[PDB]
């Protein structure tokens, strides 16, 4: 059947109706605009090269901060030392762009599907 | 007679059989 | 209105008014069509062909002049030259090669 259909021509916006007002639609709320006070920044433009210098100084400061520069009881046991290198996970937390193979999905699906 | 038939049906025979069994104006007012 | 730049619709409306001998109507349509869609070669071809089949060789020349104003592809200049070679004004075809 073709009762159930896609959209190939989505609905188009209309201008407002130029009619007499009787209907109530939007109750007033937050009718006062806040402005950036002195100290809240924004209302001060200095130049371009000063901004570039400040940006590069902040980047150099962050890189400086990151760098830091100013009978034995276990002898009949069949297998010994099976857990070397297992605790070494956590060298650097790494992002994989696959939500089916990310570590979050594996943790989630091992927690829940028991 | 449970001997095998000389002709055996195919699905295209089913599809073929499915296919096989599938004003004057007097005045201006009628126009 | 719904499909302004559709060449098939334009040709259908022009031919629907040409089959009923509404020549002035269809020439208005063709001017509007090649005004709306100046880089569609089919509309220009249809306008030059309609003007040549009606016997108005100066009309065909003025339509070709507007098209050449629009700087078309090679086939349009070739068609204009073949027109002037068909009718024998070889100096005019020389100007068109210039």
């Amino acid at each position: 059947t073709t009762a159930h259909r896609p959209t190939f021509d989505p609905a188009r916006g209309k201008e407002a109706l130029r009619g007499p007002a009787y209907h109530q639609r939007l109750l007033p709320a937050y009718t006062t605009l806040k402005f950036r006070q002195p100290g809240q920044g924004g209302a001060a433009d200095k130049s371009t090269r000063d901004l570039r210098a400040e940006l590069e100084a902040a980047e150099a400061a962050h890189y400086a901060k990151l760098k830091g520069a100013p009978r034995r009881w276990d002898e009949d046991v069949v297998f010994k030392n099976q857990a070397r290198g297992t605790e070494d996970k956590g060298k650097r937390k790494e992002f994989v762009n696959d939500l089916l193979r990310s570590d979050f999905h594996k943790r989630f699906m091992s927690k829940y599907v028991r | 007679n449970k001997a095998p038939a000389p002709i055996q049906i195919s699905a295209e025979q089913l599809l073929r059989e499915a296919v096989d069994r599938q004003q004057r104006f007097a005045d201006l007012e009628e126009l | 209105d719904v499909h302004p730049n559709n060449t098939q619709l334009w040709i259908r409306y022009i031919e629907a008014e040409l089959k009923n001998r509404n020549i002035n109507h269809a020439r208005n349509l063709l001017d509007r069509a090649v005004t709306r869609l100046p880089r569609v070669s089919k509309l220009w071809y249809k306008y030059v062909y309609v003007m040549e089949m009606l016997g108005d060789i100066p009309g065909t020349r003025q339509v070709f002049d507007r098209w050449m104003k629009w700087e078309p592809d090679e086939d349009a200049w070739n068609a204009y030259i073949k027109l002037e070679k068909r009718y024998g004004e070889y100096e005019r075809a020389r100007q068109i090669f210039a």
Partner: protein, 93 residues
């Protein structure tokens, strides 16, 4: 009766039903057939009627592969069957 062996009528009706409904609606296909369930129709397509199934006599190369794999993976026939190139019942028999 909801059982039996597959006849030619049922195989042709199954193939036409699969042509109309596809390989993911076995309940419609099984509604066409009076004696067969959706699982039996699915098993008949997967084990017999699939056009990737080789019904010719075996080669010696396939025999060598089959015996080699049956020695590798004992009684793991559904594992061996994709590697050999036939179905599991074909390799078993």
């Amino acid at each position: 009766v909801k059982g039996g062996v597959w006849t030619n009528i049922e195989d042709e009706i199954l193939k036409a039903a699969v042509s109309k409904y596809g390989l993911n609606q076995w309940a419609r296909v099984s509604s066409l057939l009076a004696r067969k369930t959706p699982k039996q129709c699915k098993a008949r397509w997967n084990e017999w009627l699939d056009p990737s199934i080789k019904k010719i006599e075996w080669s010696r190369e396939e025999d060598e592969k089959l015996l080699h794999l049956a020695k590798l993976m004992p009684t793991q026939w559904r594992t061996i069957a994709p590697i050999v190139g036939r179905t599991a019942n074909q390799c078993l028999e």
